[PDB]
């Protein structure tokens, strides 16, 4: 399962609720081709890695969250443990997404 994060407070709440679990956050947009490509793969990964938390943030809806997070490229994946950003990359690269999960869990 993927949770759509739709407020700043929700984002913090999710990071807090994760305990020590890896959290991966997909910053995306409805107009982004590469984002649309990888969305079903992000969802399949969420069903595979039961002990990793998968979040989605829409950058047009949540412009200030994205800005605060220093997002500059669509899509961006950020990785957190205990609220701390432990990794990040941009672009819709399936292998890199799953490799990074397997590097950081």
């Amino acid at each position: 399962m993927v949770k759509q994060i739709e407020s700043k407070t929700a984002f913090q709440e999710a990071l807090d609720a994760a305990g020590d679990k890896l959290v991966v956050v997909d910053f995306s947009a409805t107009w982004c081709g590469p984002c649309k490509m990888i969305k079903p793969f992000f969802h399949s990964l969420s069903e595979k890695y039961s002990n990793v938390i998968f979040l989605e943030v829409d950058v047009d809806d949540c412009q200030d969250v994205a800005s605060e997070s220093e997002v500059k490229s669509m899509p961006t994946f950020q990785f957190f443990k205990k609220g701390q950003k432990v990794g990040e990359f941009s672009g819709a690269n399936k292998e890199k997404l799953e490799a990074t999960i397997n590097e950081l869990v």
Side-chain angles (χ1 to χ4, degrees), residues 26-40:
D26 181 355
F27 292 92
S28 71
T30 59
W31 45 262
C32 165
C35 303
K36 277 174 274 174
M37 181 279 281
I38 202 167
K39 187 175 170 189

Side-chain angles (χ1 to χ4, degrees), residues 22 49 79 81 86-87 89 95-105:
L22 185 69
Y49 293 94
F79 297 79
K81 281 244 184 99
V86 300
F89 72 85
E95 278 74 21
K96 188 170 186 179
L97 173 60
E98 195 167 14
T100 307
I101 292 163
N102 280 277
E103 301 177 26
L104 299 177
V105 74

Side-chain angles (χ1 to χ4, degrees), residues 27 57-60 62-72 78 85:
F27 292 92
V57 174
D58 185 290
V59 299
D60 285 305
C62 288
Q63 297 156 12
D64 298 342
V65 171
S67 184
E68 183 167 13
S69 301
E70 302 287 350
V71 172
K72 62 182 180 299
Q78 299 186 344
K85 186 165 69 182

Side-chain angles (χ1 to χ4, degrees), residues 4-98:
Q4 180 84 37
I5 292 294
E6 301 191 283
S7 68
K8 174 174 173 175
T9 292
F11 188 22
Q12 190 55 243
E13 290 169 332
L15 288 180
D16 294 347
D20 63 19
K21 284 191 181 178
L22 185 69
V23 177
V24 56
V25 185
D26 181 355
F27 292 92
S28 71
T30 59
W31 45 262
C32 165
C35 303
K36 277 174 274 174
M37 181 279 281
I38 202 167
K39 187 175 170 189
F41 186 66
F42 192 71
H43 277 64
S44 71
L45 294 174
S46 79
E47 290 296 325
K48 181 169 177 179
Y49 293 94
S50 43
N51 299 133
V52 171
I53 296 289
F54 290 71
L55 306 178
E56 292 164 334
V57 174
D58 185 290
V59 299
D60 285 305
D61 292 0
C62 288
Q63 297 156 12
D64 298 342
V65 171
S67 184
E68 183 167 13
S69 301
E70 302 287 350
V71 172
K72 62 182 180 299
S73 190
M74 211 77 323
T76 297
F77 301 89
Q78 299 186 344
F79 297 79
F80 296 88
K81 281 244 184 99
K82 276 190 43 40
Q84 314 307 306
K85 186 165 69 182
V86 300
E88 179 173 3
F89 72 85
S90 66
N93 183 323
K94 303 167 66 177
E95 278 74 21
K96 188 170 186 179
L97 173 60
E98 195 167 14

